[PDB]
């Protein structure tokens, strides 16, 4: 592989995609999904211009979080974005910058509660089950005007959109149609949330139904670092 390549491929359907369905490329962030690869890799992509990672487990994501400070890397962004057992809450607290899987008020105040004071407030979204029924991680729509009012009040997380993994679908339809699900919740958040800017959603295969549906950030894995 050739991970600087990789990255400047994603990022032309990246913005192909936004463009075609008359959107500005700005408005779509690439988050780039490290999990299970080696912090050389991400070496790579930061040389190549990437920023913003994502990792799905707590000590593996600490420890390249660790790793590139100790090098004295500037200007990166570090998603937690798989789900989050209580008794590794600490760690994602003290060393992101993002959570993207709130699904229940007792993790969030966790969260809360261990975050340094003085680390700006953890970005933290609200993960949506939308259409996966084999999974357990993220509330049903009907929940998410009483989990983000509960999660709005922690003055130490700032609640800043949804993220959604839907089951895996091969028609475009449905992946259009159910990203389509999640931009109308997001909508709906926006209009009376301050600073509801992020709405999580889109791997690979998606991502073109994700951004026409009004993501604002995918999350890319396969793409750039090869198969897992
Ligand atoms: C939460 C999450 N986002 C993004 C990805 C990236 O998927 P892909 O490799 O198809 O780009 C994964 C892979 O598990 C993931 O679990």
């Not at 050739?2 to 913005?15: E, M, P, T, W």
């Not at 994502?54 to 937690?80: A, C, M, P």
């Not at 969260?111 to 509330?139: F, H, T």
Request: proline fraction near 4%; glycine fraction near 6%; aromatic fraction near 6%.
């Amino acid at each position: 592989n050739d991970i600087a390549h990789n990255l400047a491929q994603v990022r032309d359907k990246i913005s192909a995609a936004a463009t075609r369905c008359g959107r500005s490329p700005e408005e779509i962030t690439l988050l780039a999904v490290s999990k299970t690869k080696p912090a050389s890799a991400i070496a790579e992509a930061i040389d190549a211009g990437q920023r913003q990672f994502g990792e799905n487990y707590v000590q593996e994501g600490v420890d390249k979080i660790r790793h590139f400070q100790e090098l004295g890397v500037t200007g990166l962004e570090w998603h937690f974005i798989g789900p989050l057992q209580s008794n590794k809450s600490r760690l994602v607290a003290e060393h992101f910058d993002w959570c993207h899987t709130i699904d229940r008020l007792r993790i969030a105040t966790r969260l809360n509660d261990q975050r340094p004071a003085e680390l700006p407030p953890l970005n933290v979204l609200i993960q949506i089950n939308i259409s996966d029924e084999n999974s357990k991680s993220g509330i049903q729509l009907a929940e998410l005007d009483e989990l983000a009012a509960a999660v709005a009040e922690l003055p130490r997380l700032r609640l800043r959109g949804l993220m959604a993994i839907p089951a895996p679908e091969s028609e475009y339809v449905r992946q259009f149609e159910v990203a389509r699900q999640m931009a109308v919740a997001f909508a709906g958040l926006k209009t009376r949330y301050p600073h509801i800017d992020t709405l999580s959603l889109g791997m690979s295969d998606d991502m073109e139904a994700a951004i026409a549906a009004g993501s604002t950030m995918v999350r890319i894995g396969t793409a750039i670092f090869g198969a897992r």
